[PDB]
Amino acid sequence: VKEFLAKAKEDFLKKWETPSQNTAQLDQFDRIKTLGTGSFGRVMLVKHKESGNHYAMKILDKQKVVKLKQIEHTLNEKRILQAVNFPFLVKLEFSFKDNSNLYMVMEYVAGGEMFSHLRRIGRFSEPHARFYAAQIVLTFEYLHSLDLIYRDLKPENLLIDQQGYIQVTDFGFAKRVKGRTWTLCGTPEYLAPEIILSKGYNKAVDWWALGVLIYEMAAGYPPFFADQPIQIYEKIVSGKVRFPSHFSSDLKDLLRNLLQVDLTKRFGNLKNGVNDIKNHKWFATTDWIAIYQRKVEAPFIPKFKGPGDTSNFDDYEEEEIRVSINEKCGKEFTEF
Amino acid sequence: TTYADFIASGRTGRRNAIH
Ligand SMILES: Nc1ncnc2c1ncn2[C@@H]1O[C@H](COP(=O)(O)OP(=O)(O)O)[C@@H](O)[C@H]1O
Ligand SMILES: [Mg+2]
Ligand SMILES: [Mg+2]
Numbered sequence: 001v002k003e004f005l006a007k008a009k010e011d012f013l014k015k016w017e018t019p020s021q022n023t024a025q026l027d028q029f030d031r032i033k034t035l036g037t038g039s040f041g042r043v044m045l046v047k048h049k050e051s052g053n054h055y056a057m058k059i060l061d062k063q064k065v066v067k068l069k070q071i072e073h074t075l076n077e078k079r080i081l082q083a084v085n086f087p088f089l090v091k092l093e094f095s096f097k098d099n100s101n102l103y104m105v106m107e108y109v110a111g112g113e114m115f116s117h118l119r120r121i122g123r124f125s126e127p128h129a130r131f132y133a134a135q136i137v138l139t140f141e142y143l144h145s146l147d148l149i150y151r152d153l154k155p156e157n158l159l160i161d162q163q164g165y166i167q168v169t170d171f172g173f174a175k176r177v178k179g180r181t182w183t184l185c186g187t188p189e190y191l192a193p194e195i196i197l198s199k200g201y202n203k204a205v206d207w208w209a210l211g212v213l214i215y216e217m218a219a220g221y222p223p224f225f226a227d228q229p230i231q232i233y234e235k236i237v238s239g240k241v242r243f244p245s246h247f248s249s250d251l252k253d254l255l256r257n258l259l260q261v262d263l264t265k266r267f268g269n270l271k272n273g274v275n276d277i278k279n280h281k282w283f284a285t286t287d288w289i290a291i292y293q294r295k296v297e298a299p300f301i302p303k304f305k306g307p308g309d310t311s312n313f314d315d316y317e318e319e320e321i322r323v324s325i326n327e328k329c330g331k332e333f334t335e336f
Numbered sequence: 337t338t339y340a341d342f343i344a345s346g347r348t349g350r351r352n353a354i355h
Contacts (some may be wrong), residue, residue, distance in 0.1 A: 039352045068355055115350060156350050173353070187351050221342035229354065244338070 005145045008085070012146050015083035016176070019335070024094035024105060026323075029057065032308065034316040036113070038156075040070060040172060042319070045108060045310055054308045055093060056109070059321065060102040062329040070172075071332055073185075077171045078104060078336055086142050087294060088135045090159070090169045097336050099327045109167045111160030111302035112312030114217075118155050123220030126251060126282075128299045132158075133214050134283065134291045135166040140210065141274045144203045147176050153209040154187050155216065160312075164298025177202075188229040189222040193237045193261050207268030207277070211258030218251060219244050223259065237261070250282040 029046040032054075036043045041060040048055060065074050081092045081104065094105040114132070118124065124132070136153070143150055150173070157170040173185045180200030192208035194201045215223045223242075224235040239261040243252050257276075260266040267276045278288060290296050302312050342348065 185355055187353055225342055225347060227346045
């Protein structure tokens with residue numbers, strides 16, 4: 001563990017300093033179906049001609065990135081994603097750009113969003129939630145050791161793979177920062193109090209968001225919800241959280257230490273760091289090594305009828321990919 | 337119930353980010 005994170009940092013630093021660039025072209029792919037939309041872009045299933053592999057292609061309209069003031073965030077997203085390598089992070093296979101758009105081509109995770117299965121089933125049992133939570137704990141351990149904050153944990157950005165394991169996607173708000181940072185970004189239900197209160201914040205916001213995720217997985221609904229974000233914010237800063245009757249005492253004790261408004265007391269941010277979380281009683285039955293090596297049997301395995309099957313994804317309205325004869329935002333995205 | 341209140345709320349679908 002201790003020595004693995006040292007070797008991992010060296011490969012990351014090499015790619016962080018000299019990122020890959022322009023490793024494919026749009027005409028090398030056939031576009032098939034939209035897998036998902038987000039706040040900023042669209043992700044399509046594509047097939048790579050020479051090879052026949054299916055991939056998931058994220059498409060960002062440069063003008064829309066500019067209008068929403070996401071230039072720096074989008075450059076972080078590609079720079080960080082092409083440099084990381086971890087069993088529970090989507091792999092970036094190609095990236096390129098044209099006159100109008102930025103493209104990131106990822107491995108296709110056919111099992112669908114955690115969001116869809118969680119809403120359909122209603123809630124996950126604690127052993128089921130724990131299996132997923134352990135993968136996120138290890139993923140944040142790895143990312144934080146590289147000085148990375150993720151800042152957008154939620155079931156909509158978590159994908160289930162063929163073996164039933166998690167793949168974290170969407171590095172849109174990820175940032176490499178050694179001190180504090182100040183950007184107000186993320187999803188209202190998952191925002192830590194210190195973000196809302198315009199305090200400088202650090203990697204501890206990821207551990208708060210983990211608490212929210214575990215709650216929502218096990219309860220079926222977020223700990224703080226309302227119809228308008230403003231009322232969500234008021235509940236988050238008040239810190240008062242109620243637990244469902246069926247939560248175990250161990251689960252409630254862990255969540256009280258993750259959903260801790262006081263930065264100095266929040267698990268993950270203390271002297272022992274992530275080991276406070278790994279050593280908690282709720283994880284007593286968790287074999288961290290076996291999870292990392294993907295040797296544990298997944299509690300739920302999605303159905304697949306073949307390569308290119310999208311049945312675990314919702315349908316979306318398809319739109320044409322337009323490319324202008326004139327280059328847009330050429331040098332804003334020079335390093336992409 | 338809390339579940340009923342959530343399911344009747346406007347934020348049961350996929351959630352977008354704030355910026
Ligand atoms: N590697 C992937 N494989 C399959 N589907 C994906 C992949 N990456 C993203 N998606 C789908 O596309 C959606 C949007 O992608 P994301 O990167 O989260 O875009 P945004 O930043 O706009 O939210 C996700 O919620 C998911 O459904
Ligand atoms: Mg997303
Ligand atoms: Mg995003």
